[PDB]
């Protein structure tokens, strides 16, 4: 359900937000954006989000200050309220 696709060289993360049926896509800058930036953009898009967090595939919380480029080196878990998505970005 959450996909990562590069378009024009930048990662586009498409997510299903809880308040809406229509997917929402987030383009990020891997060199400047952080995990915390992405999670804040999610919260700004949907007031129905009470909790967002990103974890490693082993289940360890990823620091907010971590660069998006580092996040997208491997799979990760994105928690939105009570749903956990396994995100599998393409290797770069």
From Swiss-Prot:
The modification Phosphoserine is found at residue 19. Keywords: Acetylation, Calcium, Calcium channel, Calcium transport, Coiled coil, Glutathionylation, Ion channel, Ion transport, Membrane, Mitochondrion, Mitochondrion inner membrane, Phosphoprotein, Transit peptide, Transmembrane, Transmembrane helix, Transport. Changing residue 24 to A: Abolished glutathionylation in response to reactive oxygen species. Induction: MCU transcripts are down-regulated by microRNA miR-25. Down-regulation by miR-25 may protect cardiomyocytes against oxidative damage in cardiomyocytes. Residues 2-92 are annotated as: N-terminal MCU domain. The keyword Mitochondrion applies. The modification S-glutathionyl cysteine is found at residue 24. One of its GO terms (biological process) is positive regulation of insulin secretion. Its main location: mitochondrion. It is found in: Mitochondrion inner membrane. One of its GO terms (molecular function) is uniporter activity. GO terms for cellular component: calcium channel complex; mitochondrial inner membrane; mitochondrion; uniplex complex. Phosphorylation by CaMK2 in heart leads to increased MCU current. The regulation of MCU by CaMK2 is however subject to discussion: another group was unable to reproduce these results. Phosphorylated on tyrosines by PTK2B/PYK2, promoting oligomerization. Glutathionylation at Cys-24 in response to reactive oxygen species (ROS) promotes MCU higher-order assembly, leading to constitutive activation of the MCU channel and mitochondrial calcium overload. The selectivity filter, in which calcium ions are arranged in single file, is composed of two acidic rings separated by one helical turn along the central axis of the channel pore. The N-terminal MCU domain is required for efficient Ca(2+) uptake and for interaction with MCUR1. It is not required for targeting to the mitochondria, oligomerization, interaction with MICU1 and MICU2, or assembly of the uniplex complex. Homotetramer. Component of the uniplex complex, composed of MCU, EMRE/SMDT1, MICU1 and MICU2 (or MICU3) in a 4:4:1:1 stoichiometry. Interacts with CCDC109B/MCUB; this inhibits channel activity. Interacts with MCUR1. Interactions with MICU1 and MCUR1 are mutually exclusive. Interacts with SLC25A23. Belongs to the MCU (TC 1.A.77) family. Channel-forming and calcium-conducting subunit of the mitochondrial inner membrane calcium uniporter complex (uniplex), which mediates calcium uptake into the mitochondrial matrix. MCU channel activity is regulated by the calcium-sensor subunits of the uniplex MICU1 and MICU2 (or MICU3). Mitochondrial calcium homeostasis plays key roles in cellular physiology and regulates ATP production, cytoplasmic calcium signals and activation of cell death pathways. Involved in buffering the amplitude of systolic calcium rises in cardiomyocytes. This is Calcium uniporter protein, mitochondrial. It comes from Homo sapiens (Human). The chain holds residues 74 to 165 of 351 of the full protein.
